[PDB]
Amino acid sequence: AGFKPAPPAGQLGAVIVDPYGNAPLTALVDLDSHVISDVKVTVHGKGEKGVEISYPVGQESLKTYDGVPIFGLYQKFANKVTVEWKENGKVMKDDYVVHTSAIVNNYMDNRSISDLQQTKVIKVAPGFEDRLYLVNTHTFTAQGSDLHWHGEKDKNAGILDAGPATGALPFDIAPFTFIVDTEGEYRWWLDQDTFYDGRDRDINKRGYLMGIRETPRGTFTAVQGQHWYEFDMMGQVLEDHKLPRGFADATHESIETPNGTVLLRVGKSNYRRDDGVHVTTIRDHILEVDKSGRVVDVWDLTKILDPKRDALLGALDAGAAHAGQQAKLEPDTPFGDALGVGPGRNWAHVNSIAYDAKDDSIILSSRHQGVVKIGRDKQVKWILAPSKGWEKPLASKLLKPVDANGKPITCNENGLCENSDFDFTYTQHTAWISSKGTLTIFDNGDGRHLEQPALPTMKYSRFVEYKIDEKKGTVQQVWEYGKERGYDFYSPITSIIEYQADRNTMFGFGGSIHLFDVGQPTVGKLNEIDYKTKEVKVEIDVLSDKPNQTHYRALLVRPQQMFK
Amino acid sequence: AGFKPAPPAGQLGAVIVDPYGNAPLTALVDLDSHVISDVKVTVHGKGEKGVEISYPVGQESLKTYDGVPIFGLYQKFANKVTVEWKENGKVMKDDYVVHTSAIVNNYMDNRSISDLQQTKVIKVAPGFEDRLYLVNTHTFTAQGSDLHWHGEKDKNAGILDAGPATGALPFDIAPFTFIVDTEGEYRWWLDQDTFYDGRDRDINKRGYLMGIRETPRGTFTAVQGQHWYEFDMMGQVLEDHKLPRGFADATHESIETPNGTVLLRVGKSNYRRDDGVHVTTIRDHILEVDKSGRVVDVWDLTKILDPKRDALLGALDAGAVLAHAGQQAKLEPDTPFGDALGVGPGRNWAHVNSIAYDAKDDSIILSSRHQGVVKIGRDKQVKWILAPSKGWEKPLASKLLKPVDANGKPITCNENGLCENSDFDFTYTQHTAWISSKGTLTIFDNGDGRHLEQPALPTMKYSRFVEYKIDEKKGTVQQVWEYGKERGYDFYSPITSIIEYQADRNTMFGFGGSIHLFDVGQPTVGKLNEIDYKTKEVKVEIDVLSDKPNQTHYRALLVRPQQMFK
Amino acid sequence: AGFKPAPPAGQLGAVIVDPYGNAPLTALVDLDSHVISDVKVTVHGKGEKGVEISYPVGQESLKTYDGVPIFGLYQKFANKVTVEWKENGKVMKDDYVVHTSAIVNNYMDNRSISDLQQTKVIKVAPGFEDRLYLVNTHTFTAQGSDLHWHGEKDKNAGILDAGPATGALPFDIAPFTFIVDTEGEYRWWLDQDTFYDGRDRDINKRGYLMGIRETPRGTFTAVQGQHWYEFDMMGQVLEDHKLPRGFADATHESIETPNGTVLLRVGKSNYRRDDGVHVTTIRDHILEVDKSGRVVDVWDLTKILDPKRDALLGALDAGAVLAHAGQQAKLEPDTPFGDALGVGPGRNWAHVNSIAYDAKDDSIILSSRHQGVVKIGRDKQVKWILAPSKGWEKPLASKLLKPVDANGKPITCNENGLCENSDFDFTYTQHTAWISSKGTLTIFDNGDGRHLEQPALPTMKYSRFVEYKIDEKKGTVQQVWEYGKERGYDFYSPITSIIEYQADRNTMFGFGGSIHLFDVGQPTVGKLNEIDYKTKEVKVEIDVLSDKPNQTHYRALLVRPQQMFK
Ligand SMILES: [Cl-]
Ligand SMILES: [Cl-]
Ligand SMILES: [Cl-]
Ligand SMILES: [Cl-]
Ligand SMILES: [Cl-]
Ligand SMILES: [Cl-]
Ligand SMILES: [Cl-]
Ligand SMILES: [Cl-]
Ligand SMILES: [Cl-]
Ligand SMILES: [Cl-]
Ligand SMILES: [Cl-]
Ligand SMILES: [Cl-]
Ligand SMILES: [Cl-]
């Protein structure tokens, strides 16, 4: 006779490149029945300023892979890798040369600037050269949105008419998934074919790959379309679940809780409205699922919040062609992925979830309503938002702003405060709980103070942090950054922040900088900002491979944690 | 060790039930390296009046299957099968008992009457007991239509609005495919999973299985959604081709030509209208493809016929195309693009539902449900039209055939096609405009919108089997045969259906696919007929009843075991 | 327009048959956005003595299915189903008629007796009429075993020779999976295509579906070939995991622990022997995996037990492991590596066929068919062995449990395990060594090679249900219950089989999977039993007969509707 397997490279087995077929910049040293321990891997930097990648590998990983996982390779390169271990009481070491192939973008057309997204390192402070960032971005397909859910025909519709669409099946795009080091080099790549196939019409491999979040195992969960997944940094697909039959259109977030469950943001298919019309709802249901994909709980936000509140909805940018123009809501907006009130329209656009283990509750970011805590009991515990449009009983759940002495700050119904740096968040993302216990938000800032400004260039985004007293019902702004960076720091959409306790930085990714500059690539800007001094410790821009093509999120990733 | 293969049944190899996994009422006698010839198979009738199924098997089939194909088994039964052959100059014979399993309907809900479609034999004349009929029918899925093609947003649409749909992706249903004998017994079943999966959302396995037509090899072509296929009676899928990338929504017909090509009826995806809007067109493009799936030719009917002619379009029953049944179709200028009655590319202006290839002049004959019957040449020019004259403009008006009697003298008809002092009538919302073995044109004349109006009362409708003789040089048409006019609404199929002249016993075969379609709560009747061509006596009549109410059948075929295994 | 979804059946949504497409005798009442609680379903018995199936449905299930799951329907029948609930503080009820389709066996040939496995009720005591039993059985495929793993060529092999096989890929058969009631009626069916495709050569859909065991959620785990699964009684596939890349050939058992992990029985692929040859080992590795499919732990039994001990291996019936049946196994030094009786890694030296997790000390109890029953700790040390003493060396010899009577005084047994003046006997080629709800150890003692020899005549063999009490500190074992010894060869299962103590009615459940296996030309009997623990009265006896001759069953489970829908 046949063809023999690859022979051993050194003192263990063969070194296989991309063992699962989904990660071309990984490799595996086959164990070949050796009993080893105290395993450490080092991928050496390329060239003079090249970043070294080093990490331990625990027993479960060794057992799961049947070998030593090699992460952090460069593409198209004779990588130099050193593997150290203990065997039969003796200290052991091998050096390997691991040749790799190329990274391929399978989705190119006349809009392509080039095949890959270009990187530009702006700042890397001493002590931050080792940082890695997973960038969750995407690239347009040639055909664009080609599929729609079929909806229920309206009795007000024409007799001869074909039925309408419903839901958000068009929310579909090719993934562009990589890790970048502080030299702007790609050090990981998830094959686009892993989850996505844009040329076929299998809806199982369509959608918008989002909500990539680390698990307690050092693996990651993600959603795309009608499925959710788990995967690891060797490119192994560990889980692949269909959404439960009542739900559709999973986007924006997936997060594993401590209790072995996963929180997902979906819509409800065949939702019967009070007027008896069935729709697929938009971004307004939370599932808690177990690892069998069964529903442990569901929060239906159309019964918990207020689908009728258009305070922020009427103030939004219609371009987020009609860019700049404030959104004029219409009572006859057809059901679908469109700005509007009520179930069947995009009234909520929930884009992040955070689990509060202290009271078994969820904190949600509603792009179009604000930030809310909802209980296991399905009751609203608090709302962080400008007071306009909120009615009783929800109005009484609104958090009251206060200063550092605990004294009320005065603000109008639009969230403009007097004699204060305090401000609410507007069309925000990633409303999470930092390791300090505070609430961190990326405050994109479209429709700020429930209006569009005079000039487009007056908009700005903030990294913002709050301290909430749930008993007193008071919120304090304890930290902010970016207000004074202006238009080159404004991300109208997407984006993320997350506090890093290890080096006391606020990490951030602004995913849509310059989105509106027709014909220019969109900038995704990675930042680490010193929490104390506010000095920029890291800044790296990622430029889209086609013009006017937003990025979604990025994560700060840590090799020490990857291979438990 | 392992598990051994099935041991030999008799003097050849094992007998395997459903070798390809798509046809549970077939089996295969494995050749086990034997060299044989003059193969004949006989499947014996069940019980006292059971129909025997008997046929020869040619060398190509023996080689292809590596065995003797057994066709015609009853479900859930100890079938008695006899295979005869010649080996080493010696006449040989084996008798087998071939147990089979059940037929399964995978698509049932509260609408289901029971799992299978019921049969009712009405008439079987002496000498027609052997006839077998393949019924191309379907069964509703629990979810119904769940997917749409995404279209291009209208500049007149709301600013905030999501984009519209386009095309005909909701034209999607589970198949129900069997052969029935003259005792009403199922003698063949095509596993629904063969081509379809209504629970998964792989669009490659969605559509409406249609246009099942015999090939020169005794196999069959068919279309479903975005794919076309070829299969044989052992359940072997011989071709599975994606439509070429320009086209979508293949329905109604597939037919292999003498030239090794296949004619399909499709729509054009990303069709750019004169106003610059892109749509997926509806049922108005003909492809000629080769066995590599490549396009040999295309006929874009939006540039060949007249998509603005609404003479018949405005005269149709709203319920057909439940209850807005009985009501005449009122066309609107602002009907959104899609699978909707209306004029222009992007709407259902032609609804072409059959194709025939005229090998004599390398032309095609089409049935347009909403316009009439047309011959178009290789040169993409209209050669003739058979339709009422209303609505036709020049240059197409000059191509309309002129009705004449048996002596060849003009027949007087108004613009609506109502003729004076004559049996002649045009066809309306018709199907299967094919070329008989006599060279005449046979059509199933459904008769909705007859004489370009809805009648005074809803039950004043009738269908016909009809045959015409066309003189292409003179531009004249003669009606030379008809049937069904006197049978009234109980013989009226508002949609689907098919006829075909059978020379072997001089009958006209027919299947009315939608009898009593509008009878709220009643099964729909699919009526198989064979009508003696000379005497008009009913030689065969068999009724198939849908397994859910108000659920149409599409077509049926007269199938012949002697031809199935070349 | 399109095709609408099924309309509501009663006061909730449509009733859909077989929502996931894997379980034709289930249905779902769609919730259609209703808010309900206190759901109870009742499926009424068919005819006069028909068994009623009744159960509650919890909120997680309602949410997961977006509806009310209906379990227990009869095939091809107008089932009468009643669903009761509470909505808006008001007590509600609907009666549905749920028509179903047929059960299909997709794997039939000349060996088939008929399509389904026949049942025969022998005994049903008062108070046991409600019992349901899931039978994990299988049906031969036409082609048999068609694939092998490729191994490493031997240096002693011929120069020109192709490479050898390795591992156990031929351990591959179609599944036949149903639930039977006390009237012998099929009340659940798992579509064979759910996990298996014996006609295609996708090894991902090959294997021997086995180790079906309930989870803490009322769902079930299972293994087939190179994948492990979780499914529920609506036919929903909840997990499908490839084995981790180091391992192959998962058979016999899968069991979820309290810790959210699953224990599997596998072989090691590319196992490097001390002589440097690479083989896929056979049935001698235990994995603990999490729900991410990752390896939490592994037990390599080739380094823990003794692969050279041939005390039992040399004493076995050649026909088991047809006809070389009756003949004692003669081991050979040159038996090629593979699924073959023999010593050492690469051969079938252990054939481990059950796993049990002892949550009290985080240990595992294994049944090795060819060695005995063993407890191994988290620390990978043998804690105790239950086996005849012959062949065991030190250090393992000191771990052998010492037989004692009810007063705790030693019982005298020879090295072959034949005891004096005592009912005590060891187990031989046993299965399902599990921990009863009482904390005792229950085993199905098949009894091939009993007392480490083949008997004088072949029919001098018997099986037992047996239960033991183990004192781990003293290292002593007491036999506290047995049954089947007096029932002779007509109760002897040479292979497969299972017992399980049922506390709810104080019975010992059992399934003998291979009764009359060697009866050339006769179906094989799978005998379901429930034996009153106290009186030893037969409360239930039901026979399942294979659909082809000499075709073993594997296991059965006592299933409980009250637990199926948490
Ligand atoms: Cl270098
Ligand atoms: Cl290189
Ligand atoms: Cl190397
Ligand atoms: Cl036979
Ligand atoms: Cl029937
Ligand atoms: Cl035909
Ligand atoms: Cl138009
Ligand atoms: Cl007539
Ligand atoms: Cl009903
Ligand atoms: Cl039966
Ligand atoms: Cl169990
Ligand atoms: Cl050996
Ligand atoms: Cl006994």
PDB file of C-alpha atoms in Angstrom, chain B residues 307-386:
ATOM      1  CA  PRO B 307     -45.622  38.495 -22.331  1.00  0.00           C
ATOM      2  CA  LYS B 308     -48.153  41.326 -22.466  1.00  0.00           C
ATOM      3  CA  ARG B 309     -51.056  39.285 -23.942  1.00  0.00           C
ATOM      4  CA  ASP B 310     -53.661  38.973 -21.175  1.00  0.00           C
ATOM      5  CA  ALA B 311     -56.569  37.609 -23.279  1.00  0.00           C
ATOM      6  CA  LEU B 312     -56.501  34.259 -21.468  1.00  0.00           C
ATOM      7  CA  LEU B 313     -54.745  35.508 -18.286  1.00  0.00           C
ATOM      8  CA  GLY B 314     -57.686  37.704 -17.255  1.00  0.00           C
ATOM      9  CA  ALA B 315     -60.214  34.915 -17.905  1.00  0.00           C
ATOM     10  CA  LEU B 316     -58.949  32.359 -15.370  1.00  0.00           C
ATOM     11  CA  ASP B 317     -60.299  30.846 -12.147  1.00  0.00           C
ATOM     12  CA  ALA B 318     -58.600  32.343  -9.073  1.00  0.00           C
ATOM     13  CA  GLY B 319     -58.950  29.003  -7.246  1.00  0.00           C
ATOM     14  CA  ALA B 320     -56.795  27.091  -9.770  1.00  0.00           C
ATOM     15  CA  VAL B 321     -53.521  28.434 -11.299  1.00  0.00           C
ATOM     16  CA  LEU B 322     -59.344  27.451  -2.763  1.00  0.00           C
ATOM     17  CA  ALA B 323     -61.695  29.035  -1.919  1.00  0.00           C
ATOM     18  CA  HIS B 324     -61.411  32.098  -3.997  1.00  0.00           C
ATOM     19  CA  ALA B 325     -62.624  29.402  -6.381  1.00  0.00           C
ATOM     20  CA  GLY B 326     -65.164  30.221  -9.093  1.00  0.00           C
ATOM     21  CA  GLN B 327     -63.999  33.861  -9.140  1.00  0.00           C
ATOM     22  CA  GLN B 328     -62.500  35.257 -12.361  1.00  0.00           C
ATOM     23  CA  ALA B 329     -58.892  36.470 -12.154  1.00  0.00           C
ATOM     24  CA  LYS B 330     -58.645  40.265 -11.931  1.00  0.00           C
ATOM     25  CA  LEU B 331     -55.163  41.257 -13.087  1.00  0.00           C
ATOM     26  CA  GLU B 332     -53.435  44.145 -11.314  1.00  0.00           C
ATOM     27  CA  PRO B 333     -50.744  46.526 -12.625  1.00  0.00           C
ATOM     28  CA  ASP B 334     -48.876  46.331  -9.292  1.00  0.00           C
ATOM     29  CA  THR B 335     -48.792  42.533  -8.795  1.00  0.00           C
ATOM     30  CA  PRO B 336     -45.361  41.953  -7.206  1.00  0.00           C
ATOM     31  CA  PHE B 337     -42.870  39.821  -9.124  1.00  0.00           C
ATOM     32  CA  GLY B 338     -43.062  36.114  -8.355  1.00  0.00           C
ATOM     33  CA  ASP B 339     -45.121  33.006  -9.034  1.00  0.00           C
ATOM     34  CA  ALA B 340     -48.244  35.088  -9.590  1.00  0.00           C
ATOM     35  CA  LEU B 341     -50.703  35.511 -12.475  1.00  0.00           C
ATOM     36  CA  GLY B 342     -49.713  38.558 -14.472  1.00  0.00           C
ATOM     37  CA  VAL B 343     -48.006  39.973 -17.518  1.00  0.00           C
ATOM     38  CA  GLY B 344     -44.300  40.456 -18.183  1.00  0.00           C
ATOM     39  CA  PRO B 345     -40.998  38.754 -17.271  1.00  0.00           C
ATOM     40  CA  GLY B 346     -41.024  38.121 -13.506  1.00  0.00           C
ATOM     41  CA  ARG B 347     -44.634  36.963 -13.376  1.00  0.00           C
ATOM     42  CA  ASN B 348     -46.484  33.854 -14.480  1.00  0.00           C
ATOM     43  CA  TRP B 349     -47.414  35.090 -17.957  1.00  0.00           C
ATOM     44  CA  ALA B 350     -46.748  31.865 -19.929  1.00  0.00           C
ATOM     45  CA  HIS B 351     -46.771  28.932 -17.490  1.00  0.00           C
ATOM     46  CA  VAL B 352     -45.326  26.548 -20.096  1.00  0.00           C
ATOM     47  CA  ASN B 353     -46.133  22.972 -18.983  1.00  0.00           C
ATOM     48  CA  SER B 354     -45.171  20.608 -21.788  1.00  0.00           C
ATOM     49  CA  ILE B 355     -42.510  20.225 -24.475  1.00  0.00           C
ATOM     50  CA  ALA B 356     -42.394  18.068 -27.605  1.00  0.00           C
ATOM     51  CA  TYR B 357     -39.520  17.746 -30.063  1.00  0.00           C
ATOM     52  CA  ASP B 358     -40.379  17.618 -33.766  1.00  0.00           C
ATOM     53  CA  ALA B 359     -37.448  15.698 -35.197  1.00  0.00           C
ATOM     54  CA  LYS B 360     -38.742  16.337 -38.739  1.00  0.00           C
ATOM     55  CA  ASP B 361     -37.800  20.048 -38.671  1.00  0.00           C
ATOM     56  CA  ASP B 362     -35.651  20.268 -35.493  1.00  0.00           C
ATOM     57  CA  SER B 363     -38.335  22.341 -33.761  1.00  0.00           C
ATOM     58  CA  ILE B 364     -40.149  22.353 -30.440  1.00  0.00           C
ATOM     59  CA  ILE B 365     -43.866  22.399 -29.670  1.00  0.00           C
ATOM     60  CA  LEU B 366     -44.817  23.980 -26.324  1.00  0.00           C
ATOM     61  CA  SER B 367     -47.996  24.129 -24.295  1.00  0.00           C
ATOM     62  CA  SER B 368     -48.352  27.549 -22.689  1.00  0.00           C
ATOM     63  CA  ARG B 369     -51.159  27.268 -20.168  1.00  0.00           C
ATOM     64  CA  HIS B 370     -51.781  31.006 -20.280  1.00  0.00           C
ATOM     65  CA  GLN B 371     -51.336  31.603 -24.035  1.00  0.00           C
ATOM     66  CA  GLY B 372     -51.943  28.431 -26.080  1.00  0.00           C
ATOM     67  CA  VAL B 373     -49.893  25.975 -28.082  1.00  0.00           C
ATOM     68  CA  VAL B 374     -46.911  27.124 -30.170  1.00  0.00           C
ATOM     69  CA  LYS B 375     -44.281  25.685 -32.472  1.00  0.00           C
ATOM     70  CA  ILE B 376     -40.896  27.418 -32.314  1.00  0.00           C
ATOM     71  CA  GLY B 377     -38.013  26.578 -34.640  1.00  0.00           C
ATOM     72  CA  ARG B 378     -34.322  26.021 -33.985  1.00  0.00           C
ATOM     73  CA  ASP B 379     -34.047  29.545 -35.448  1.00  0.00           C
ATOM     74  CA  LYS B 380     -36.118  30.880 -32.501  1.00  0.00           C
ATOM     75  CA  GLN B 381     -38.944  31.991 -34.860  1.00  0.00           C
ATOM     76  CA  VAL B 382     -42.582  31.119 -34.121  1.00  0.00           C
ATOM     77  CA  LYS B 383     -43.738  28.671 -36.841  1.00  0.00           C
ATOM     78  CA  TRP B 384     -47.379  28.449 -35.789  1.00  0.00           C
ATOM     79  CA  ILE B 385     -49.785  29.172 -32.931  1.00  0.00           C
ATOM     80  CA  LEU B 386     -52.976  27.307 -31.944  1.00  0.00           C
TER      81      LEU B 386
END
